Amino acid sequence: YINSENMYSVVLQSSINAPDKIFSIRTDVASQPLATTLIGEISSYFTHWTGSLRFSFMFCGTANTTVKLLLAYTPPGIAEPTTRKDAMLGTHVIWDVGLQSTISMVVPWISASHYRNTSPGRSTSGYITCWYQTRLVIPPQTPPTARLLCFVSGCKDFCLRMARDTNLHLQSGAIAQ
Amino acid sequence: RIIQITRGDSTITSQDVANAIVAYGVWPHYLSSKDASAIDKPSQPDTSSNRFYTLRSVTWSSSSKGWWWKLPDALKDMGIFGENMFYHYLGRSGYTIHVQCNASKFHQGTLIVALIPEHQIASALHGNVNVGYNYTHPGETGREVKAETRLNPDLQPTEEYWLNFDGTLLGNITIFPHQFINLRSNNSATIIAPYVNAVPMDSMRSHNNWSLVIIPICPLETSSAINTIPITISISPMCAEFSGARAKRQ
Amino acid sequence: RIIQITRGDSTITSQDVANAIVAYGVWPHYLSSKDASAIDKPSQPDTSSNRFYTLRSVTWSSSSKGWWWKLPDALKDMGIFGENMFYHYLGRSGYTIHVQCNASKFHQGTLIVALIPEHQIASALHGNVNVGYNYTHPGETGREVKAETRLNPDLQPTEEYWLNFDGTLLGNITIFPHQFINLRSNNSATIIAPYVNAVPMDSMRSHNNWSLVIIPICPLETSSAINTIPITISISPMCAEFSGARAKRQ
Amino acid sequence: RIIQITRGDSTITSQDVANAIVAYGVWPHYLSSKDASAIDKPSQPDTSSNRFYTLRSVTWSSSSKGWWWKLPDALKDMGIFGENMFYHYLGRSGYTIHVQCNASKFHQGTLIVALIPEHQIASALHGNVNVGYNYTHPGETGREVKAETRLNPDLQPTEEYWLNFDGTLLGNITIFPHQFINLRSNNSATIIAPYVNAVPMDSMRSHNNWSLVIIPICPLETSSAINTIPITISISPMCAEFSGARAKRQ
Amino acid sequence: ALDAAETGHTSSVQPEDVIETRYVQTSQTRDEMSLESFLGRSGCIHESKLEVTLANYNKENFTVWAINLQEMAQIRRKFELFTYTRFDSEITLVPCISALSQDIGHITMQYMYVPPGAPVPNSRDDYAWQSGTNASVFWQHGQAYPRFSLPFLSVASAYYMFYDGYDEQDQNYGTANTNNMGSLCSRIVTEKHIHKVHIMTRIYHKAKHVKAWCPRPPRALEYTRAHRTNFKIEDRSIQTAIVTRPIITTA
């Protein structure tokens, strides 16, 4: 998917009676892939960060189609979850996919320190994790498929310190002209 | 016909639901100094347990017959709620319950959901028998209703759903606080209840002070290849309280 | 979620759209005596050109890759707007844009539309090369993105849509004023912008002071035999002005 | 020289003790809105955990060398305190501590008790080594000091008590809040402390934000056949708080 | 908590909506995040390397460089973040002498800002080293680092970070049209002498009293061609800052 739009997107399988994991990610602002977001790059230009992050999600599938889904966050010091019920013990939202397009939700700031370092080395901030709260149900002869697109931004809570020449980009040699 | 719900840390919605009737109109509340029996200032986990928790997926078909749970036992494993229950001789709590049951515009069928009191289940077998603890207290695993071969049958409850498993007629079951999942009417259904007992608080693990029933009053169907839909239920305890702290109950 | 739109003589609607964000909140306006460079009282065609005009049908498929335009060049043929542009050395205008993209309830896929500034396109080829005028100025004919064999490739722009054709990541493109055509969310999408430049007005044909991009972020599909849908875009110029009248530009 | 003590549900006394100095005179308290980092309203188990809990019996002899603990780890198993700790990424708590150490009128010897901060223990072995988690976090089992054969020695802390296990002189240890069990002076000793860190709250299981040391400064003896006495310590957490609820920590 | 991201507007804004928070004095200043901070730290811009030629000392020993922010990546990426920007400029010179000989002696060095249509010096002896009105400035061995404040220059309100067209007869597409600032220049001022030496000036700038115009997405890949946004490098492939993983269910 990398050389294309599709790395911004995930595909869902209406065929599956299961509770199971759809995807998961870190939450450290300058970790992959999040670093590549513009908040990611701005954080990558910085050494300290603070405050909670906004996350948002559109059910990009066929308008006739229904589901409800679990979006969840893992407070760290612990492995990334392996059952839906694990994520249900974490802070989470269940998406009523009503007429409205998007669910939006926040990883709460739960750093011990008022800031955290923007890039972890041997360190962690926690996980995003995503699960089939119901099965996805298309009505008959709809495409046997759906799409989801995922967004992030700084909340009103968000801030940075120690502006530094960013990790994210490299120059080799002379820039020609 | 839209709602959002928020308890302790966690939130719920349907955008195709008609609001819960509050059971008997009594919005949930803590015990009163006027009515209490227990002497201590009791355990208020508040937000950390008057929050939602949800059961494993059941799923249903035209062939399916029914499901139910008994509370608090159905929630014995709900972290804070579960252990705070098991570590006290007594407690009390009401509940907010929502059942999740969306289909397409192209399905038919209907479930009745009934919140129900002590719901004292009848045996399967005739004669000098009564229900065994393992089955009255199925935990979150619950009791789906099935056609066959449940062992220890002498201690099993009856499977007879249209006799409400106690020898009372279904359809009069609307005497309790209830709703219908009707796939045309709604995509979900909801009910909320205070605490209740003949006693101001109760021996949680020893007595299911509330119970919840869901019944396929009208058979599930669609022409679509998705011949079946899951159901799941989420519950938050309400004003949850516990008293007589000691070791973890076995 | 319904709108109607009226500019100069012509009107537009969607009854399944969420309103435009106005670009940076600045509702379009004429130049100011406080900021101007040009000396004359400039040409205000008003209603006769601050009115809608629309582009030839593009159409899209699961296999499709993207489309864009550069303004005012994309409107060089829009009668009054087009010639009033070509007959002046300078002008300025904002725009109201709506993209028309209805599907059935039974389709999925999504486009991002981004209004975008100078959007300085990168070459296709490596090395000591730059984009040729014919391609930077595609007129109303625009630039759809294709897999193959565009001649004069050394002077062609890159086709690399997910690198925004300039070596910047897509998905951060929401930095600009933007909308999604999402077939569930809406049947159309809209954006409006004032004039902008580092200069109070600009050499219209020599510099595309604004640009517009539409990208298949999620592939078009339906099970229906109508495997593809057109898109079309309509634009009205805003507060359009022109100065330094002389012959028609070639 | 008599005291009684009451926290959360449980009570303590000595009728031969001189009162605790409160550490730095700061009586324990919750976090402030002025100083906090964490965003939620945090977990206040209050009475159900700001109550006493006590460690397994150590016992001592003229031959004995010392004992210590690191907190909160030393209390990881204290029911409500322990799990509420393990289920949160962060928390904070101060402590009230009393050490129980009665002898007859016919015994001599003395212990120093020191509450101590981060107390960053030195390795046993020389060179490129550091202390392993199993030993920094001995749990309630604690670290008694012994003459011999502790395995994994490269990851063991030093046994060198009179060098405070960190290369600092004992006897200056009275720089910290401290008391003496002196068998003539008292039959017990006590200390209380607020929370402390460079941070407004901390990663409980990952960092022992406080530590407690007891040392046989003067050898135990009596002529009586009861050649040895147990010691035990009881602790209540103070103003205990927890934030960032998730699964149980391993 | 529900919205239409398709609006273009940012999503459901508020953190207190889905967390039962305690009140906190969230009280961390955004001032380091200010533009007069982020733009307003200096960085290097260009590299004026020269050799002192002997055989015609009088001819060769000068350099000229076309002023741009487009050939050192970090500074470039600060400005490759907007449509336009405006600022006054701290300019700072880090002259360095490298010896190819047993000594350097005293050395003195000229710089000149050559605005366009100044006569460009052709020779280390050119009359153009006279500078009645051009900003020309001097450095010598043992002197402190030279600096000057240069005000915002453009004929327009702000510098084009990008441009979408041409000079009016249709070549040089983009900033190579708009960004004709002319050039910096340098030249050894000491007369012919025996020491073979290299002079290198690292030149630095910080934008302050800054203003900026409509943010635009950051550069994803190595630079290539100063004015031009070209990025598809020769005999190479588009290895962006994104890194792949084995499965999307594994963090």
UniProtKB/Swiss-Prot annotation, chain A:
Subcellular location: Virion; Host cytoplasm
UniProt superkingdom: Viruses
Positions of transmembrane segments: none
Function: Forms an icosahedral capsid of pseudo T=3 symmetry with capsid proteins VP2 and VP3. The capsid is 300 Angstroms in diameter, composed of 60 copies of each capsid protein and enclosing the viral positive strand RNA genome.
Quaternary structure annotation from Swiss-Prot or TrEMBL: Interacts with capsid protein VP0 and capsid protein VP1 to form heterotrimeric protomers. Five protomers subsequently associate to form pentamers which serve as building blocks for the capsid. Interacts with capsid protein VP4 in the mature capsid. Interacts with protein 2C; this interaction may be important for virion morphogenesis.
Protein name: Capsid protein VP3
Span covered, complete protein: 391 to 567 of 2150
Swiss-Prot record, chains B, C, D:
Protein localization: Virion; Host cytoplasm
Organism field: Human rhinovirus 2
Subunit structure: Interacts with capsid protein VP1 and capsid protein VP3 in the mature capsid.
UniProt lineage: Viruses, Riboviria, Orthornavirae, Pisuviricota, Pisoniviricetes
Name of the protein in question: Capsid protein VP2
Portion of the full sequence shown: 81 to 330 of 2150
Protein purpose: Forms an icosahedral capsid of pseudo T=3 symmetry with capsid proteins VP2 and VP3. The capsid is 300 Angstroms in diameter, composed of 60 copies of each capsid protein and enclosing the viral positive strand RNA genome.
